[PDB]
Design a protein around this ligand. Structure first.
Ligand SMILES: [Mg+2]
Lengths: 108, 49, 98, 229, 49, 229
């Protein structure tokens, strides 16, 4: 699993160098497609980890109130919220050559 | 006007000290391309702005 | 997205309660929206869109008032002045679009 | 007790600090106060601070600042320009002026650290500063004058009528601060996004830490405004 | 011009202003005076959606 | 310890001062410090000083601000705009909020001074301010609420959810300072003519004395600048 605590991906939108992004494939569109597929995978993994963590801190309350207050759950959710977005993590992985891609049609 | 400066640092110091005008013609030493296309230091007549 | 973060934080268990909280404009909504805006650009479009620069992506920031703040350097591309012009805001959803 | 409704910062946050540059943060601020504090501190930091710098230099065989010393790569104009960059921190108290006549030979490069052996009351803060490049057979003799002053003073005001013949007046950068810059960013507090955050950039020459300069500026402003009590 | 001279106003409204944030006088004089402004019906409350 | 040669003023000197206008001097000052002190004080004076104003109004028989009181020339909107202009000076200490019930009849003009017989903790500084013109047979029964605040609070923020029916919230302009003007003149101390002299002219509404306004602005500036210790 990725070390989300020590990730170098930018938190917000940043001006990325297009030449570095498409250097490996020679086509910015192919790189964008690969990055988005990896971003979908990263988002799935992050959702699974967050769901497990929330289930660990989930408290069973039988009250019929519409608003609940769980400070530990709120803190965990805030920590996950402050992390970079999945697509930013995918871009950071792509820049660091941490994404493996293969074209099935070209290798057939 | 007419002052010489070792770099942009002294120009900024003088401008912040109000000892030189923004539109004054000054001389500064900084990097600029030579006739061969290389980066060298030379004294160039310029303006604080 | 704010609804998703509300259910993740455990404040509200249903989308209806999240909608009620959002409609009341509570400070927690702004705290979540500040993080949600990060890394999720919007698309600004001014009609007529004569060239592709008529639609551009910008990183949104929360501001006060009811007017959209535009960077001055995009005006030439958008052919937009501040004499009463309006622009449409489009929000991409999927990671591919972002 | 009436100051309950006025939002004020709790501390000045220090992001990055070296011996030459520093970054400070001041948040949250009421609207308009960031500009006031930043402008006041910038003006005080620029105008007020004192320092020491070279005022006059004489070389053997030179009569004016438009000649050539035999054996050095740099001309006398460049020599004076590099001398302007030498930074001095006082070592012995109450020493306000020292005239140092140096003699260095057998070196291909004369650095500011060579002056330190012959200067008594001052410590050179940048000993690695190259002053002149010369051949191994060249011997140079300088007499430099170090004085205390404020701010930036060109040669015309530093000129003394009793200076020895052949001496050239040198523009002196006495101020320890090289540049002060501040920018104000909108800071969000609960529901309001009109609150302000002030960040500060101070670049010094090494004689004073940027945090120390900021503290001195704040102390000076407090002393000035206390008289309205 | 006669009316401004009688009123103690600089001719053509050309007066030196001061910045509210830093207090420094602007480098050039600015045209200052009283202009009649109208509020039009194209208000932002009806256009945000 | 290097602050020996900075000539600092001894006191702030009051040339002429009434309860509404005050002229002050600040000397001797180092060059450039007059602008810093003056601009900081002007901004703090025009920004953060506390005051008193009206927050809610309830006229009997009036349910919304877009109605009319029988027999009164001015509509409720003009009455509200005039009520916004009333100025209060505190007479009893520790009084932060007061509810005033006003019943005026048999008069041809309702002035702010007519509120004084019902207000206990505050003093009306402009009793000549006309609220409305009424007929001799018109009886006006209104309830106003006076509170403490800073700057400007719109009527939207002043709306209380527990207010009684017919209560109309009003815009509140809490600022007590009407104008701050400062000038910088050169001052000669012994042989140096470069020292600066600061002149201050403050116009207040009468709720706070100009000297007290200067003292409070200085207090705010000290409180902000202590954080850089
Ligand atoms: Mg237009």
């Amino acid at each position: 699993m990725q070390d989300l605590k020590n990730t170098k991906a930018p938190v917000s939108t940043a001006t990325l160098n297009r030449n570095e992004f498409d250097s490996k494939t020679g086509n910015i569109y192919e790189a964008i497609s690969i990055a988005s597929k990896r971003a979908v995978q990263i988002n799935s993994d992050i959702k699974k980890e967050l769901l497990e963590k929330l289930e660990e801190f989930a408290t069973y309350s039988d009250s019929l109130e519409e608003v609940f207050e769980n400070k530990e759950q709120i803190e965990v959710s805030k920590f996950y919220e402050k992390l970079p977005k999945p697509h930013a993590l995918a871009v950071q992985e792509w820049l660091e050559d941490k994404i493996y891609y293969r074209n099935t049609e070209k290798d057939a | 006007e007419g002052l010489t400066f070792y770099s942009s640092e002294e120009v900024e110091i003088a401008f912040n000290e109000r000892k030189v005008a923004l539109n004054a013609i000054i001389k500064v030493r900084t990097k600029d391309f030579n006739e061969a296309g290389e980066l060298v230091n030379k004294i160039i007549e310029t303006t604080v702005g | 997205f704010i609804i998703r973060k509300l259910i993740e934080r455990g404040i509200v268990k249903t989308v209806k309660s999240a909608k009620k909280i959002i409609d009341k404009k509570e400070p927690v909504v702004w705290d979540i929206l500040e993080n949600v805006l990060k890394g999720h650009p919007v698309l600004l479009n001014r009609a007529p869109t004569l060239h592709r620069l008529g639609i551009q992506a910008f990183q949104p920031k929360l501001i006060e008032g009811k007017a959209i703040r535009l960077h001055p350097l995009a005006c030439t591309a958008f052919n937009a002045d501040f004499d009463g012009d309006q622009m449409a805001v489009h929000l991409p959803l999927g990671p591919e679009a972002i | 007790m009436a100051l309950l409704n006025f939002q004020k910062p709790d501390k000045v946050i220090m992001i990055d600090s070296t011996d030459f540059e520093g970054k400070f943060e001041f948040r949250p601020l009421e609207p308009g106060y960031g500009l006031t504090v930043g402008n006041a501190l910038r003006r005080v930091l620029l105008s007020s601070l004192e320092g020491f710098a070279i005022t006059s230099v004489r070389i053997d065989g030179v009569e004016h600042e438009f000649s050539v010393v035999p054996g050095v790569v740099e001309d006398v104009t460049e020599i004076i320009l590099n001398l302007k960059q030498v930074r001095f921190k006082r070592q012995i108290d109450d020493v306000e002026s020292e005239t140092v006549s140096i003699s260095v030979s057998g070196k291909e490069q004369l650095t500011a650290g060579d002056f330190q052996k012959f200067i008594s009351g001052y410590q050179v803060l940048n000993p690695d500063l190259v002053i002149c490049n010369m051949g191994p057979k060249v011997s140079i003799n300088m007499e430099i004058v170090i004085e205390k002053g404020r701010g930036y003073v060109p040669a015309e005001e530093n000129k003394k009528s009793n200076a020895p013949l052949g001496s050239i007046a040198v523009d002196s950068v006495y101020t320890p601060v090289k540049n002060v810059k501040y920018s104000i960013e909108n800071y969000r507090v609960e529901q309001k996004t009109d609150y302000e955050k002030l960040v500060f950039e101070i670049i010094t020459d090494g004689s004073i830490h940027p945090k120390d300069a900021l503290t001195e500026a704040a102390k000076v402003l407090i002393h000035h405004f206390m008289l309205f009590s | 011009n006669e009316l401004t001279d009688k009123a103690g106003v600089p001719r053509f409204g050309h007066t030196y202003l001061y910045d509210g944030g830093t207090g420094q006088r602007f480098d050039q004089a600015a045209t200052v005076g009283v202009i009649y402004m109208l509020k039009l019906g194209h208000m932002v409350d009806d256009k945000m959606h």
